[PDB]
Symmetry: C3
Subunit: 104 residues, 3 copies
Amino acid sequence: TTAEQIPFQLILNSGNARSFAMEALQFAKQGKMAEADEAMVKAKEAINEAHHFQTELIQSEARGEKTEISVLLIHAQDHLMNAITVKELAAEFIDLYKKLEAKG
Amino acid sequence: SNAMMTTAEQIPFQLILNSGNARSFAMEALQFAKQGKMAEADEAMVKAKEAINEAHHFQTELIQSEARGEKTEISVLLIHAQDHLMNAITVKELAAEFIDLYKKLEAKG
Amino acid sequence: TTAEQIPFQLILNSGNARSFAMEALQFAKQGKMAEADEAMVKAKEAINEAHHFQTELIQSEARGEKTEISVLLIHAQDHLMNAITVKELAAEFIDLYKKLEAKG
Ligand SMILES: [Cl-]
Ligand SMILES: [Cl-]
Ligand SMILES: [Mg+2]
Ligand code: NA
Ligand code: NA
Ligand code: NA
Ligand code: NA
Ligand code: NA
């Protein structure tokens, strides 16, 4: 049943990653580039934490273990995957703001 | 299914309707901002938010059902519906960021 | 699991489409608009492959033909939904870069 903690740990870490990435984007918008870079570093860490749980989840099935699929679990997987997506495009927003500061 | 739709099977359709409209409002807003139509963009974002709220109502009921031990039937459509809801939230959140970026680009040139 | 090859195929096509789309963004970022545009055609071709799998998943179920639900399937659907959104917003980024070029 420890495996049934997977959804919670996914949501918690993914939300943390998503939060860091958006914070990074806001810093970049305000011209605080050092703070933006740091937040992204932290976002990368958080997505790593989340991935540990996703990997175990996928390998569990691969391994032949039966997993009771719930809405919560599906929702947890959406959190991680959307977090990865937010982080990837946030990096592009950050990069664009850096480009714009270069010109004045 | 096409032969018979159960009451529970209504949830995915409702989530897709509202989430889809949320995503549509967000993209409409993005497109407005791109044209320098900022007030129309701001208002479409409000409607995006409202549509996510309506979708969210079904979400809470769905999660809580499970909490009660009321096992939901997992289907492709339900998974897809969940994807759409979470997608709408992501699109709205980033479209906000496109809109702000378009406002900044106006502020300069 | 002969139908369980579909998740694998969804993941592969979607992942490649996402990569293609990101390639396009980086090209446009470098001022390489021809390469960007070409990268997006490839993204669209790969999205279509995965999308075709998904339409059949949804339609078959509507017909009463039940699919075996697994973590990998759910994962596969996440890959497509996010690939679609990345492609779509990468296109918005490409437009932003083209915009910045045109003004100078
Ligand atoms: Cl991982
Ligand atoms: Cl190529
Ligand atoms: Mg999903
Ligand atoms: Na960028
Ligand atoms: Na509302
Ligand atoms: Na359930
Ligand atoms: Na922004
Ligand atoms: Na754009």
